[PDB]
Amino acid sequence: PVGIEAINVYCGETYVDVPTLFAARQLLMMARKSVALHCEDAVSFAVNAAKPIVDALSEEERGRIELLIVGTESGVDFGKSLATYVHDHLGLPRSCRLFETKQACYSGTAATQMAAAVVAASPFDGAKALVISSDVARPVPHTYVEPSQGAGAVAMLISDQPVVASFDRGANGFHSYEVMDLSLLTYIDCLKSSFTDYARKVEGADLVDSFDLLAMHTPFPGMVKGAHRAVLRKLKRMSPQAVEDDFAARLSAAVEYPRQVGNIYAGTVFLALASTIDNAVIDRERRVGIFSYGSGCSSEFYSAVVTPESQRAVRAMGIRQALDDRYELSVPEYDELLTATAELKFGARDFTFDLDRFPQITKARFGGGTSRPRLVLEAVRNYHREYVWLGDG
Amino acid sequence: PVGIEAINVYCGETYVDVPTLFAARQLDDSRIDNLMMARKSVALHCEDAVSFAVNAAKPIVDALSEEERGRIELLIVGTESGVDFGKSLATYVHDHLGLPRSCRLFETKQACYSGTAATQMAAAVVAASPFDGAKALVISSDVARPVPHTYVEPSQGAGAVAMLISDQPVVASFDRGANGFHSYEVMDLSLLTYIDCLKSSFTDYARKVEGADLVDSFDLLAMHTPFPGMVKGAHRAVLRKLKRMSPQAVEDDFAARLSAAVEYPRQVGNIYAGTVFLALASTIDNAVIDRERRVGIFSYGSGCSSEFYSAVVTPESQRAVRAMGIRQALDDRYELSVPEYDELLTATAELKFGARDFTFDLDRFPQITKARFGGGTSRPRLVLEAVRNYHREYVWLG
Numbered sequence: 001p002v003g004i005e006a007i008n009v010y011c012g013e014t015y016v017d018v019p020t021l022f023a024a025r026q027l028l029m030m031a032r033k034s035v036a037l038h039c040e041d042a043v044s045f046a047v048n049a050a051k052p053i054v055d056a057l058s059e060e061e062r063g064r065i066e067l068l069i070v071g072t073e074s075g076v077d078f079g080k081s082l083a084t085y086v087h088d089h090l091g092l093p094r095s096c097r098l099f100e101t102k103q104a105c106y107s108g109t110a111a112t113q114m115a116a117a118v119v120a121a122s123p124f125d126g127a128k129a130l131v132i133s134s135d136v137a138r139p140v141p142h143t144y145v146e147p148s149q150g151a152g153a154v155a156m157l158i159s160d161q162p163v164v165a166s167f168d169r170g171a172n173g174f175h176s177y178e179v180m181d182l183s184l185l186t187y188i189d190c191l192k193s194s195f196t197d198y199a200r201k202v203e204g205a206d207l208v209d210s211f212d213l214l215a216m217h218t219p220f221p222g223m224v225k226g227a228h229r230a231v232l233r234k235l236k237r238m239s240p241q242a243v244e245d246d247f248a249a250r251l252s253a254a255v256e257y258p259r260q261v262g263n264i265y266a267g268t269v270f271l272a273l274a275s276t277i278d279n280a281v282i283d284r285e286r287r288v289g290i291f292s293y294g295s296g297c298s299s300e301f302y303s304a305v306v307t308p309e310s311q312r313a314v315r316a317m318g319i320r321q322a323l324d325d326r327y328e329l330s331v332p333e334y335d336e337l338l339t340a341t342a343e344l345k346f347g348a349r350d351f352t353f354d355l356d357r358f359p360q361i362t363k364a365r366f367g368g369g370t371s372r373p374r375l376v377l378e379a380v381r382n383y384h385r386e387y388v389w390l391g392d393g
Numbered sequence: 394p395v396g397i398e399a400i401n402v403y404c405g406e407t408y409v410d411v412p413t414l415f416a417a418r419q420l421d422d423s424r425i426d427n428l429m430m431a432r433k434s435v436a437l438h439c440e441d442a443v444s445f446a447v448n449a450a451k452p453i454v455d456a457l458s459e460e461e462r463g464r465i466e467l468l469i470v471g472t473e474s475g476v477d478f479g480k481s482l483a484t485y486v487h488d489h490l491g492l493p494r495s496c497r498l499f500e501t502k503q504a505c506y507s508g509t510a511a512t513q514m515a516a517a518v519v520a521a522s523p524f525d526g527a528k529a530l531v532i533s534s535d536v537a538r539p540v541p542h543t544y545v546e547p548s549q550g551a552g553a554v555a556m557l558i559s560d561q562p563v564v565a566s567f568d569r570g571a572n573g574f575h576s577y578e579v580m581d582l583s584l585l586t587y588i589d590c591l592k593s594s595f596t597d598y599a600r601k602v603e604g605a606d607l608v609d610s611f612d613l614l615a616m617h618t619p620f621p622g623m624v625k626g627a628h629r630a631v632l633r634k635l636k637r638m639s640p641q642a643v644e645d646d647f648a649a650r651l652s653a654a655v656e657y658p659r660q661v662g663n664i665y666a667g668t669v670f671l672a673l674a675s676t677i678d679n680a681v682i683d684r685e686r687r688v689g690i691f692s693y694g695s696g697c698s699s700e701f702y703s704a705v706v707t708p709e710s711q712r713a714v715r716a717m718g719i720r721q722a723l724d725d726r727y728e729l730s731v732p733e734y735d736e737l738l739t740a741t742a743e744l745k746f747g748a749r750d751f752t753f754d755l756d757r758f759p760q761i762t763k764a765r766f767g768g769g770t771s772r773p774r775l776v777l778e779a780v781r782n783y784h785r786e787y788v789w790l791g
Contacts, residue, residue, distance in 0.1 A: 087576065121517040
C-alpha cells in the first residue's frame with residue numbers, strides 16, 4: 001500500500017479579490033487569488049509548505065526520506081534544481097536523491113507517481129519521499145488568465161503508511177502529445193482519453209460509478225465545470241440536470257480551495273485533493289478519481305482511497321484558517337507587488353531584496369502579530385540564492 | 394529483473410580537436426595533460442537537445458515491433474538545455490518518435506544528475522507495475538553553449554544517450570535497491586564536491602549492500618566524466634582514503650576498471666546528463682565483456698546530487714551495444730577548423746533563450762551538410778528549423 005502519508009499547503013499570506021480585479025482591469029467561478037510577496041519564490045513557497053510535515057517526523061522517520069522531488073514551472077536555473085535549496089532548509093539527510101520535474105501543471109503528478117514507484121519498488125519497508133509542487137507564476141496584467149493565476153505549494157510525504165490517500169496500484173491512464181483557444185479542447189481531450197486509458201487497465205471503470213469524489217487540475221473552477229460537462233455528455237450521454245447534480249456531488253468540494261487560491265500550476269490538483277478531503281463528509285472508505293493535466297501536453301487519470309483518518313489528518317493542517325488569515329490586497333497594492341516581483345529576472349547574477357518594501361504586509365503577516373514565521377528570498381549573490389526566516393524576531 | 398534493454402548515443406556530426414583549440418585560444422598548453430581530452434563534439438547551429446534526443450532514440454524505437462512500441466508508457470528527458478519554463482522537451486521528442494499517446498511525458502533537471510534521476514524513476518515504474526512488459530524511454534540530452542576563452546570550453550561537448558528501460562535488460566541489469574545517495578546544496582570547489590559525493594554515495598551504497606567494497610564488488614566502473622582527468626583524480630583520492638592502496642595499485646586499478654569508461658567521453662567531452670551513460674556504453678564497448686561483470690556506476694550533478702549504483706553486463710550486452718556502431722559514428726564526425734568552430738558558436742548564439750520567432754538557414758555551413766546530415770553516405774538527422782510563436786519546428790535533413 002503506497003500513497004500520501006501527510007499533506008500540507010502554503011498558498012501565501014496575501015490575496016486579491018477576483019471580481020474587484022476583473023472590474024479594475026476593465027474586463028471563471030473564482031473568488032480570491034493568492035499573491036506572492038515580491039521576495040517569495042518557488043523554493044521559499046516549497047519550504048513553507050513542507051516544514052510542518054517534516055518537523056512532525058521523528059529523527060528516525062526523517063532519516064528514511066531518500067527522495068525529494070520539486071515539480072515546478074518556476075525554475076531558477078538551467079541545471080540547479082529547486083530541490084537543492086529546498087533540501088538545505090528542511091534539515092533532510094544527505095542520503096537523498098534531489099531533482100526537479102517539469103511538464104507544465106503535470107510536474108507535481110509526475111513527481112508523485114515517480115516517488116510512489118520508488119517506495120513500492122524498494123526492497124526495504126519504510127522508504128519515504130517528499131514531493132513538493134510549487135509555482136509562483138507571474139501574472140501578465142490585462143490578460144483574461146491573470147485573475148485565475150495564484151501562488152502556492154503543496155508538500156506531500158509519500159510512503160507505505162498512506163494515511164491521507166492510498167493510491168490504487170496500477171490504476172493509471174495516460175494521455176500525452178505535443179500541442180501548443182485549443183486550451184479547453186486539449187484539457188477535455190486529456191480528461192476523456194486519460195480516463196479511457198484508466199478503464200483499459202481497470203476492469204469495469206466508470207467515470208460516475210467507480211468514484212465517490214473527483215479532484216482535478218483546476219486552471220479555474222469554470223474550466224473544471226465545463227470539462228466535466230463535456231466528458232460526461234460524450235462518454236455517458238447523461239441529461240444536463242444529472243450532469244449538474246454530479247458536479248455538485250463530486251466536484252464542488254474539490255474546487256473550494258482552488259476558487260479561494262487560483263491556479264498554482266503543479267500543486268493545483270493536490271490542493272483540489274486536500275479540498276475534497278476537507279470539504280466533503282468522509283464517513284468511511286471513499287474512492288477519489290484524480291485527473292492531472294499540464295498543457296503542452298501530458299495528462300494522467302488515477303485514483304486513491306481516503307478515510308475518516310484522512311479527513312482528521314488534513315483537518316489538523318488548518319488549511320481553511322491559513323487561507324482566511326491572508327492579508328487582503330487592494331488592486332493598487334497588488335500592482336505594486338507585481339512591479340516589485342518582476343525586477344528579479346531569470347539568470348540574474350546579483351540582486352538584493354528590500355524585505356521591508358511592503359511594510360503593511362510584513363507588519364500583519366510573515367511573523368507580524370499572530371502570524372507564522374516564513375522563509376523568503378533575500379538575495380542572489382553570484383547566482384547563489386540566499387533565504388532568510390521573516391518573523392525570527 | 395529491471396534495467397537497460399537498449400542504448401544508443403548521438404554525439405553530433407562535427408568535432409574540434411582539443412589541443413588545436415587550446416592553441417587557438419592561447420590557453421596554457423600544460424593543462425591538456427590535466428584534462429586528458431582528445432576531441433569534443435560540436436552541435437551545428439540548427440541542433441538542440443530535442444533534435445539530439447530524437448537522433449539518439451530513433452534506432453532503438455525503430456527496432457521495436459508495433460506491439461513493443463505500444464508498451465512504452467513513460468518518456469523522460471533529462472537535460473539542463475530546456476527551452477521553456479513549462480513545456481518539457483519530452484513533448485517534442487514524443488511527437489518525432491511515433492510513440493503512443495498512452496505515455497507520461499516530462500523533463501528531469503539536476504545538472505548532470507538529470508539522466509540518472511530519469512533512469513532510476515523509470516526503473517522504479519517498470520519494477521512497480523503490476524503488469525509485465527512495461528517499457529520506458531529515458532533520454533539524456535544536452536547542448537551546452539561553450540564560453541570562448543574559458544578552461545571549461547574544451548571539456549564541453551554535445552550529446553544525447555537514449556535508453557529503453559524494461560524487464561528485458563539485455564544491456565545492463567540493475568542491482569535492485571543497491572543505491573547510495575549523497576546530495577546537498579552547494580555552489581573551483583567542483584573537484585572537492587565530486588570527491589565528497591563519490592566517497593559518500595559509495596559509503597551509502599555499502600550501508601545498504603552487505604560486504605560492498607569499492608574495489609572487490611565491481612569488475613568495472615563508469616562515472617560522470619566532466620573530463621577524464623577529474624575522474625582519474627577522484628578515483629585516486631577516494632581509493633587513497635577508503636583503501637590506503639599504494640600509488641601503483643591505484644594506477645593499475647584505473648587502467649583495469651576506468652580506462653574503457655573514459656574512452657568515448659575523451660572523444661566527445663562532457664555532455665552533462667548523458668556522460669555517465671556514454672561512460673557505461675564506452676565501458677561495454679571498450680572492455681572485454683567475457684562473462685557476467687558488475688559495473689559500479691557513479692552519477693553526479695553540480696549543486697549537488699549524486700548516486701552510486703551497480704548493474705550486471707554480459708557478452709549479450711557487448712553484442713547489443715556493438716551493433717549500434719558508436720565508435721564508427723564518432724570516427725565519422727566532420728573535423729572542424731577553429732574558425733569553422735567559432736562560426737558555429739556565433740550562429741548558435743543567434744537563437745536566444747525565450748526567443749519567440751527565429752528561422753534557421755539549414756544550408757549556412759554547406760561544407761558540413763554536403764558531407765554529413767544526409768550529405769554523401771551520412772545518415773539523415775533531425776535538426777531544428779524554426780521557432781514560430783514559441784513553437785519549435787524540426788526538419789529531417791537526411
